[PDB]
Design a binder for this molecule. Structure first.
Ligand SMILES: *[C@@H]1O[C@H](CO)[C@@H](O[C@@H]2O[C@H](CO)[C@@H](O)[C@H](O)[C@H]2NC(C)=O)[C@H](O)[C@H]1NC(C)=O
Ligand SMILES: *[C@@H]1O[C@H](CO)[C@@H](O[C@@H]2O[C@H](CO)[C@@H](O)[C@H](O)[C@H]2NC(C)=O)[C@H](O)[C@H]1NC(C)=O
Ligand SMILES: *[C@@H]1O[C@H](CO)[C@@H](O)[C@H](O)[C@H]1NC(C)=O
Ligand SMILES: *[C@@H]1O[C@H](CO)[C@@H](O)[C@H](O)[C@H]1NC(C)=O
Ligand SMILES: C[C@@]12CCN[C@@H]1Nc1ccc(O)cc12
Ligand SMILES: C[C@@]12CCN[C@@H]1Nc1ccc(O)cc12
Ligand SMILES: [Cl-]
Ligand SMILES: [Cl-]
Ligand SMILES: [Cl-]
Ligand SMILES: [Cl-]
Ligand SMILES: [Cl-]
Ligand SMILES: [Cl-]
Ligand SMILES: [Cl-]
Ligand SMILES: [Cl-]
Ligand SMILES: [Cl-]
Ligand SMILES: [Cl-]
Ligand SMILES: [Cl-]
Ligand SMILES: [Cl-]
Ligand SMILES: [Cl-]
Ligand SMILES: [Cl-]
Ligand SMILES: [Cl-]
Ligand SMILES: [Cl-]
Ligand SMILES: [Cl-]
Ligand SMILES: [Cl-]
Ligand SMILES: [Cl-]
Ligand SMILES: [Cl-]
Ligand SMILES: [Cl-]
Ligand SMILES: [Cl-]
Lengths: 534, 534
């Protein structure tokens, strides 16, 4: 072993690059391969382990981003473009990135990031995901993986082995297997790996907790604005098949057999599958994505609900939470009456159009039930109330209530739960005020962007980012976000009985209980009973 | 014409009695017959007009009270005994009472009182109904009628003419016909008659507004805590028949034909029918009575809802309202966990037992819907919240929301609506504090008991009674409760658009809007759609 930027792993030697960070420096090994390129006849198939290489792998520059739908609703606007691929797109995209403190640690806490983006998009190379601030400030080895999204990672024709489904989840598991096998050479302790992600990434984290084939590969888990049981996170095998066939029908494919269909889908260039991706959804809806995990009986033994009830899952500690206005993004992009440069005050007619779009699987009784629940009939024509009420409908149904069901089911068997409610609106936010604390905007605090002066955050925001980075890192390290024997206020543990949680903002810590119970009893207990009876 | 206490009517001469009232005096003609005694083969039949008499009728003492169930839940307790018959009970009970100012007016405003008591009880002779205070203070001719209740006034075997149903309503209409024909001789103006009643009496008033055969007999209407469309106020002809047959089955009657059944029921003494009256209800329930008006296609042309929608009803002015805690009486008497001498804090189990009892016709989804709606899940085990929530369930479902539906349907076609919310708890109340402002306790203010010193009301309460007596009387007289060109605050008119109403207490008048819309949209629009779909 010669240099600090050279590391010999079980797959071959890797050469990194020194990176500047807050007046200091650390090491980064970017673009390390963990699977063979899922190209050609490999498209839609399970990932294959990367064949070991001779010589030295150049790990000094980020890798390609997986083929995905690109958002151009607001061309040039940073608010939306900070999420788009910032590297060239390619089906050859299964790589991982590692940020190592300097000098190289011997056996320190490890954190693996799993990006979100509704399983149809996402990149490990985004600026808000730069792990050098976290690695540096908290001295953890920070890993960020990648995984096939869209049809590429989730086209599902159950029964077939050419496109069984969930391969994007299997891509994640292989990156986690590689971390388990090689993170030691980078100074990481494979027995103290914490996986964390946001949105589809948080749902993924929860899916690795559930899937028996993934449990042994990590120690602890953090989930941000995502839960495995989210209504948009999975589909039955019948629906997945139905959508795969419909995708084929959009490309004038032969539909006589799975082989015919799959072969045809494999002959198409990437952008061709992406171009008709959204045409397969079964309803006019928001917060619904075409290709997602399928409850196959393999990666997922049984229905998610029976697994949560039987305690059929990994038991450990978890730290999770949600943002105050999870729904605003999805209404801005597809609900009538909402627009980026307007206060978007909503009319009674658009409110109702929005309820229909938000609970696509509901019948009329169900739609009325929802409307009754979120309408102030003492002032039903208040455009701001209609807007905010619709925002909460989308956030409660799609993120918060599903996470609260998961939190409650998990706590009965887990070894420690820490729940947070993130409600701070960034001072340099480019989105309109009506969107509030947006889906995905706690991430910048988790990765420490506020400590970077040029980004223009207030001093209190830098403080908030530090507390957060330290809660996350201390939790990953010990199973508890609080410092042992500290003076600071204690984030209390979430219990079945007390159900406490804390707010996460620039104000002095404050503890609360039963996060949105009223609305969540509606969403998790009532509405489903109603839909199953009618 | 010789004396002030002697009056010659179209039915014969009547002799009254001078009565003392607040240091002064007035005349009272008590026990005037308006129908032939519905005795013997007359039981269950339509009322027959009283055959004119020779000589002078002694109208100096109250008449008998109709045969009815007598309440002995709290023997000796005034709170419950002030509602029980205070005269001997008899099937010979169709009489009316008149209080005439002195000196006798020539043609003044007339008010006719229709007592309540769920159509199974009630008397025109109760102390809280003494009309001398109102007649005196407001100089109106005050009439109080009587009508058969229980099986006697509402046994219904549609198709038959021996017991067609609604005869108790027909008893009321005949008393109103007699007032139309003879009130002139007592100084009353038959063209300015206002009918008013509480509970079943208020529902009756609304039924006379609906029934084309009753409309021409009165000018205006006042309804207190009752509405024709209340869930307990009527039954289909099938259900009435079903209950009449079940009553017969309780007395070991022959059930082969209506004639057999009716003849048998006619051979039984009164107390025998009363003794098994409650055994015919179809569900374990509260706020439900055995024999009530039937939607027969005669007195009621069509369903109450289609009549309200088509505007098929008398168009005039109406003044109506409800009390703050309508449900407490019915929970005290039959819901588990409630008792007279306890604070009655309710357990989650009794709350649920109570929901079942309160919405007897509901399936499980419906029961859950109700529970979800009235449960504070942030503190579901608060015994006081469970108690009060259950109180509102009973009041909203049985009185307030049905009245608000009626108010809204009526206003689209009426000539003026005045709505009130009575929320003052009497200072000398003998019932426990948890019952609040009880069903039936605004009556004592409407009849002016507070002006009687010996009854122990505060000075402010005497003031409240006077404003109320004067709103009622001024409304009966002109169609508007407000004084023309007055300094006092104005009770605004209730409109389809603004929906304003006022509170009625000892505080300075205050106007509000949309009385209990949130809960009433639930009860009037949502729940029924839910029950009709499931
Ligand atoms: C997490 O699991 C640990 C170990 O399974 C729990 O610690 C045990 O707690 C019981 C009760 O105090 C003791 O009898 C054992 O000796 C403990 N083991 C050790 C090594 O500490 C711990 O209580 C669990 N924590 C939570 C929040 O459930
Ligand atoms: C109650 O009815 C009366 C009479 O039908 C209404 O009075 C009429 O109002 C219109 C509009 O102002 C006038 O053109 C008529 O000349 C009025 N008639 C009389 C004799 O006043 C009155 O508006 C109605 N009130 C309510 C509250 O609906
Ligand atoms: C590593 O590869 C990148 C590819 O563009 C190149 O820019 C860089 O100079 C290379 N470094 C070495 C030592 O190969
Ligand atoms: C009227 O009848 C009642 C019946 O008890 C009696 O007390 C009263 O004295 C009678 N008066 C006359 C004049 O008949
Ligand atoms: C990761 C993000 C945050 C918002 N921008 C990115 N795009 C997207 C789409 C869906 C989702 O749930 C989450 C996301
Ligand atoms: C008239 C009263 C007021 C409470 N005491 C009398 N009894 C009774 C029963 C039912 C009802 O709706 C109303 C009543
Ligand atoms: Cl920097
Ligand atoms: Cl779903
Ligand atoms: Cl096929
Ligand atoms: Cl489709
Ligand atoms: Cl859309
Ligand atoms: Cl739950
Ligand atoms: Cl929950
Ligand atoms: Cl921003
Ligand atoms: Cl802005
Ligand atoms: Cl930023
Ligand atoms: Cl909940
Ligand atoms: Cl007196
Ligand atoms: Cl009903
Ligand atoms: Cl019969
Ligand atoms: Cl029965
Ligand atoms: Cl009962
Ligand atoms: Cl209504
Ligand atoms: Cl209404
Ligand atoms: Cl009292
Ligand atoms: Cl008391
Ligand atoms: Cl009294
Ligand atoms: Cl309403």
């Amino acid at each position: 072993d010669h240099s600090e930027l050279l590391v010999n792993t079980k797959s071959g030697k890797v050469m990194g690059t020194r990176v500047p960070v807050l007046s200091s420096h650390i090491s980064a090994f970017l673009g390390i391969p963990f699977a063979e390129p899922p190209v050609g006849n490999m498209r839609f198939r399970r990932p294959e382990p990367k064949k070991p290489w001779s010589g030295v792998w150049n790990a000094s520059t980020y890798p390609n981003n997986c083929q995905q739908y690109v958002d151009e609703q607001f061309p040039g606007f940073s608010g939306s473009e900070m999420w788009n691929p910032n590297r060239e797109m390619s089906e050859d995209c299964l790589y991982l990135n590692i940020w190592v403190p300097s000098p190289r640690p011997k056996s320190t806490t490890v954190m693996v990031w799993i990006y979100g983006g509704g399983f149809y998009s996402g990149s490990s190379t985004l600026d808000v995901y730069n792990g050098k601030y976290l690695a540096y400030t908290e001295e953890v080895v920070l890993v960020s993986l990648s995984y096939r999204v869209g049809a590429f990672g989730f086209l599902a024709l159950h029964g077939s082995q050419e496109a069984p489904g969930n391969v994007g989840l299997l891509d994640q598991r292989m990156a986690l297997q590689w971390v388990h096998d090689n993170i030691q050479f980078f100074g990481g302790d494979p027995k103290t790996v914490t996986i964390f992600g946001e949105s589809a990434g948080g749902a993924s984290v929860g899916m690795h907790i559930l899937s028996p084939g993934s449990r042994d590969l990590f120690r602890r888990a953090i989930l941000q604005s995502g839960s495995p049981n989210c209504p948009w996170a999975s589909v039955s095998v019948a629906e997945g098949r139905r959508r795969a066939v419909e995708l084929g029908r959009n490309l004038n494919c032969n539909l006589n057999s799975d082989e015919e269909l799959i072969h045809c889908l494999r002959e198409k260039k990437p952008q061709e599958l992406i171009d008709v991706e959204w045409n397969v959804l079964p309803f006019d809806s928001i917060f619904r994505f075409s290709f997602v995990p399928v409850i196959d009986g393999e990666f997922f033994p049984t229905s998610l609900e029976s697994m949560l009830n039987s305690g059929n899952f990994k038991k450990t500690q978890i730290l999770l939470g949600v943002n105050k206005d999870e729904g605003s993004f999805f209404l801005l992009y597809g609900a009538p009456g909402f627009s980026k440069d307007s206060e978007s005050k909503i009319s009674r007619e658009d409110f109702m159009s929005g309820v229909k779009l938000s609970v696509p699987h509901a019948n009329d009784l169900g739609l009325d039930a929802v409307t009754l629940q979120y309408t102030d009939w003492m002032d039903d024509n208040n455009g701001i109330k209609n807007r905010d009420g619709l925002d909460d409908i989308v956030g409660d149904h799609n993120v918060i209530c599903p996470l609260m069901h998961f939190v409650n089911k998990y706590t009965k068997f887990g070894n420690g739960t820490y729940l947070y409610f993130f409600n701070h609106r960034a001072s340099n936010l480019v989105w309109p005020e009506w969107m509030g604390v947006i889906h995905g905007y706690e991430i910048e605090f988790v990765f420490g962007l506020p400590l970077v002066k040029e980004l223009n955050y207030t001093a209190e925001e830098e403080a908030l980012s530090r507390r957060i980075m330290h809660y996350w890192a201390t939790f990953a390290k010990t199973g508890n976000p609080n410092e042992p024997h500290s003076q600071e206020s204690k984030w209390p543990l979430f219990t079945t009985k007390e159900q406490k949680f804390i707010d996460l903002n620039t104000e002095p810590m404050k503890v609360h209980q039963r996060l949105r119970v009223q609305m969540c009893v509606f969403w998790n207990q009532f509405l489903p009973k109603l839909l199953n009876a009618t």
